[model samples]
Target chain A: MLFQNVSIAGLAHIDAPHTLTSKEINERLQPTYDRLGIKTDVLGDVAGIHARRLWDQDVQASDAATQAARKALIDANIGIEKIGLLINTSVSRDYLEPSTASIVSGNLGVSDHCMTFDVANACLAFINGMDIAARMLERGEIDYALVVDGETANLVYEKTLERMTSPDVTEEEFRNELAALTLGCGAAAMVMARSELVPDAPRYKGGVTRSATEWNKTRLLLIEGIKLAQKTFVAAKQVLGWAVEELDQFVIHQVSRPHTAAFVKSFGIDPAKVMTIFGEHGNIGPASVPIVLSKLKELGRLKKGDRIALLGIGSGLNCSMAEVVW
Target chain B: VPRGSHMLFQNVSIAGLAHIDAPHTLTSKEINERLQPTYDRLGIKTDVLGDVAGIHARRLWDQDVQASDAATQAARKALIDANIGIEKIGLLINTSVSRDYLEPSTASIVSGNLGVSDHCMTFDVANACLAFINGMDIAARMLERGEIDYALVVDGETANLVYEKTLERMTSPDVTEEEFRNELAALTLGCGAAAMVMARSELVPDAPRYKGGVTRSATEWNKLCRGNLDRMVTDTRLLLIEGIKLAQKTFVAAKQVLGWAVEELDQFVIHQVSRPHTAAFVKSFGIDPAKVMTIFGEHGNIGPASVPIVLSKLKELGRLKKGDRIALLGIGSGLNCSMAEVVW
Candidate 1:
């Protein structure tokens, strides 16, 4: 899939409050650790997640997404009324119906003509939403679209902490619950439009998606996921004409330090080209790619005509890789 | 209320439409019998469900049926109806409010059940009852762009758990009038599944042309309808009022984009929440009552599956003609409304 006119006009991200360090978490889990006779620092040493942030209060996914949407609109120098399509791609949802997109649209006060819906594909959903909006933009159906994602792991962490601290908890259960600690709270939104709408903005050349649904039952298998993503990169190479040495940045979805290092080593990509927020902010699910890109923009790291690769290995054993030419 | 000419889709056609009617029938009479005690306690004597809501009966699946199972069944039927094999499908979207789990997506489960090829892309779209139209538009974009030859949009709605739980709560001794009113809409939901295969007009030259239409929203009314895994709460009056207002605006846009005229259209496949909601919508647009079919009286509100199920039923009944101009419309819980056209 190749897009002709779709451009990423603006990007923004919101960091959550209340940083909790891995050392603190270890202290809290020290009791269970003593009972299970675990000697290693699972959170800090093994996962390399030094800290992660959370919302001070219970924040609905819609609210966080709305906050990011407003900032993204401002970055694009446009208003919500100009947006014709809004898609929420967060794993954290408000309800089973009505869609979190509607609530975010209402909060942003988008025009009645705006279309809204929620797309769920785990961490790959934001990329999927971008492709969906890009197709419509290329077809000239709408002038502008917004892709928003907000992830909250507060409830998961709270429950996991409670369950893991129990005296009756086993080592296997504790290991299963360890992944919950790596999840942090964040939101990201990208305002996409026709190239004519934002002549100097980054252009989105669409990429390919390949799935291995046989591994759907397994939540995460880092090595297997990496192998599948390698296959996906083969398709991406044919479509985008991508070469490892030519790309400037790799804004990949962060799972862990080890996972990111393995992907970098397997692909023979420069470690300097990739940025890691998982050590600080942890993995923010679907928001990871766009948030890291937004941070790069704010840090003045991206250059004009630079080829940036956005990739993610989400649940359902799905791998998607699309390119952004700034 | 003016339509911009920018949103008209081209070269998209509906290749196939099919639906699965759940086997178990749960009539309003039986529901009322169970709720009689709550009604007596609340001092309600008007037979509000059958008389006012106009829902006589609704269907249900067996106790163990999942949303993915029902959707997979419909997908197979749709593929057969299209005279195509499962391999022809490049993208499959599950747009049902009834989901199997919070992770891994219901679309993956359905695709796995259907044994879809590795090249097939899948995801779930959730937008209350308007999701089928949303899925259709998504697929239309892919078809119009020549990115894929065929795409399947499927929905499976199951209200079995909501009904069972709501009935248990209403029959409890501590039930109150307000709670009962809020839970009444749960009984109106039925179980069913529908799937539509959309393709480029060149691929399916003789099939119905799908000219994509317009969407309007009043998301401030989004909170009027909320549902969970086992229960739902609704403010019927607010949903009706806000939904109608949004639909009115959407129709104005549809008129400009689709060249729609009330008398010119042959049939209307509208999402049915109740008898009055359907009647009000038709009267507001001055549409002929005969053009619109009423399945809520028997099938009940099937959420996003309602529009496609009704359209598929009409197709199966041979009610459509070669050149009939049909309208597919719905006002979902988000106070969101969409109206598209189909030329049979």
Candidate 2:
């Protein structure tokens, strides 16, 4: 299914200014790093992440989300009252009581008629939000919608640091802890509208997804991300009839540099057509894909009629791939 | 415009509704004792909450009662009320804010406790205080579309943990008085559980039929209020005014789409946050003050359980009858408002 005039009105991101270089990250974990005899700078060397930004202290997810929402509104050139729905696809939330989306809605001065909530399927949340908005738009439910996310690696970093430095810490867990280093703090927002509403904007040509989740219990670090990506691409090929060579741009989830490289090589996608922000921004969880797309917009690379592919594997062991025709 | 209708189920109705108010009651007096030092330090006067929040007292559940336990208790009563066995259920949705764990959804735990069959689908919908309504709407759609014959919407709130932690931190000398006052509302929150069983309309011909409503949002005010397992920090003043504004717009949409009438509706089952907030909303909507039944004074704000719990209370009191129009209104953490109609 496709929405006739659905387009990405605007997208933007904000990163925490504090820098934590991989060398610095490694140095902080030196005792454990030495104990585990982990010599390689995994985040820096393998993932190409020299540094990632982090919020200071307890920066709530709502704060960053508000920032992103404001920017997205500016980018879309739409006022708050125009938003009919807001879906928060954040992996990090401020509380368990009121939804993070509610808090964001309140901050954005959205009209009372706006529907807001969260969708948690790990990193695939953004794509889910996009599809949900597309359906609502296609149904003529509303003309415009906002999908926003503000992910925090602060909690993971804090908890991981404590666990790694604990007296009972073990060397065997070092590999598991490495995944934490790849995370960076950031937020993103997207404004979507029906095809007839924003005819000049990019048209979202929906993609496909397949999930074989028996590998769910492999835990955080033991994730066979490559194999998952392999199957995901197969599903992509079968469903979207994706010809890797014909795609204009490929925006894959930045799980890691090695993971990205493996996915590119296995799929034979032109490396030149693929864009990577992992080196500077790291993985911002569900915000990864949209953040790249937003970057494409800022760089003036995403022109009208451009064919783009979005691929990612989330914590649900879910893999989703979608195409958009600009 | 003729609203296009899609049926998700054929004969589903809300067969039963029930709620459990945790036994312990914590008064504002005792709370003030613990907060006297902080109050004095903040240069405050008598009845910080009384003068500002209009919350006289609220209930607190015992430590042993988990969200699942309360939800299961309500579910059992609801099943019995509907004259059905646990095996009849095809889906169970846990919409509670207080969850036992992230995985193995509280729905599964409630299902296991009720001895639901293996074929029953289970999941958790965490949309903050709005979850129960979300769960109910989803269940109704499924029932209408024939996806399932019976579905349960359950919620259990544990506001005691938040009260305990907020009080502890407020008592700390390091905590600024401003910080303590900003969090006072979290301490006033109460604990409880509620459940509603929705079945196909054909199952109970005259049972209240849930007429689905609409929702809107103001993402800008998302941070106005938030709560976790231990504590909640909210901008109380802003949350109240903003939440009301959201409700106003949502109510207009409801009045238009659901053909809602303030004078014709027999009762209003509104989520309780505080007496003043409720009163303010009631007055703003020009709803009959008597039509609004509130348990906030005794139960406090039971998160997602508030709306269903009030409806259950109305049912128990025999204040409702078949063909009586009722409105199920809720304003949750997502700053989301879901206003559905039911013909009891």
Candidate 3:
């Protein structure tokens, strides 16, 4: 439970250049589809993903993250020096060493005192990064912090497409990898600061996290993720005075049409209140929530004092439900 | 309230610490023997690892072992050392360069392995080499705020793939001297794991107090060292120079905030990248060599786990005493430097 001081100073999202649709992807997997005798347009019809975006060749996670970070800096109307911390929460990474955050910071020319790192917990990491930065901000450790996520599904799409077309592929494997094809490339970044520093910015009253691995199954978190989110929502209500009706917008990690539906129905949240981009952008992994929120802001869907709910169902069956006040 | 490196924390304590050494050891002598042809091919006459870096041997886990496996082992040991059950751990953070997957975090894997309760929160913090300290500081904040009673900070560094790939690539006929030199740091890396159980001061009896610390970064040097599961390319020379320069500024803030006095701190648990870096740091600060422990000679640089591994080893050796001050410092690949303190 977090309250007071923390605010969202800036927010931005980058829609990748290439638009790769499910029909185009299905054409590549048509052979496997015939062999497996699966006629359903699983990705477009079942997953409700009409299309997803992809990046140009060899655009690393750090590259996309750096792009979004620059836009966020502009949106915040602050220079790189104002940022004290940079935490990259992308599920996609350039390497196992020299965190993507550092690469972005290097690209942005941050001041020497800025701390940067990567937080990985799957789709929920953006929220985790925000909470982490909030703690530091609330403590007056730093005036401003940047949380960035850049997801690259280009390789996953390439490899999964290549593998699924092979004659040796199985229906089980195809079913499992269907989720992979639903992923899209996107980038999101935000500037977080104390409320006093950004008087007009949205207040961030951080929320709760819960794990349900004991009760698990996306192969690892699909159904259990929503169950875990239910538990997390209960915790949120206790801590943040959260109720489905109280939240004006439900910005969620777009796992799929069914996942978003299940999560929405489980909480009895108004479908109209939820702004989703999964239809056009697919699931951008950790970037999904922030990108959706950033879009909501850009479109003026939120007004000051409107409570917004941000939900995540990361792998490891982790669920986090955080509240933001516009 | 303070800003920048002046931020100070209270009510956080180290309730337990543990390190797990990998079973297999690869000595520099053996590595040299295997690389003799490559060394001769590249016209390299010096034993760079053993003679220059002062690394006699380094450990490696089995090829199939994922980072989460070793981290869970260390976490188990840390829990036992803390005399607590997994249910008591409200938060678990994995800070390692090596990870299992991009989607499912290694922290969650360890948390799952430990059978954490529904209340347990998990995430992985990755800041090349300096992440363990960052994780502990993150946990320290949670403990200080009373958000959690016990938090686990774990790191498992597996350099197995890097070792295999680098060795094979170095043996290639067309490999260049520049590439070999840049890849040398990968060879110096060793596989190991470490974990610490952090708790609110009131939760543990006579627990070591974690007084928090200061951080300074030089991200412009971030590209100087970069790596993956297979190989790393680092300008070790520049890393050492900029690393020390950053640590110097960090120590200045540490003195003002942590009241740091090199002579007064009983133990300097520094993340050692090489013997030369250690010597340079100590010399630059006029610190006593005897106060600092060097495990790089055997285990090599264990990435972010280096400090806690050395500190846990010091605990096993009965080197830390009650009321002793321990200085934990590291300059990681972000060109990041953190100088924190603990009172035993």
Global lDDT of each candidate: 0.90, 0.76, 0.90
Model 3's DockQ? 0.78
Rank order (by DockQ, best first):
3, 1, 2
**What TM-score would chain B receive for each of the candidates shown?**
0.97, 0.95, 0.97
Docking class of 3: medium
Using DockQ, give the best candidate's number: 3
List residue ranges in candidate 1 displaced over 4 A. Answer: A166-170, A218-220, B1-6
What share of the reference contacts is kept in model 1?
0.75
DockQ (model 2, Cα): 0.24
* Residue A221 CA displacement from its true place in model 2, Å: 6.7
What digit string (tens of lDDT, one per residue) describes model 1 on residues A1-326? Answer: 57888999899999998899999999888878888799889879988999999976779999899989999999999988889999999989989987999889888888887888999998899999999999888878789999999888889888999998887777888898998899999999999999998998999998888887777662357988998899899988898999999999999998998898999999999999998899999989999999999999999999999999999998887889999999
i-RMSD per candidate, Å:
1.1, 5.5, 1.4
Q: Is candidate 2 or candidate 3 better by DockQ?
A: 3
Using Cα atoms with residue i matched to residue i, what is each candidate's TM-score against the true structure?
0.96, 0.76, 0.98
Q: Over 4 Å off in model 3, which ranges? A: A215-220, B1-6
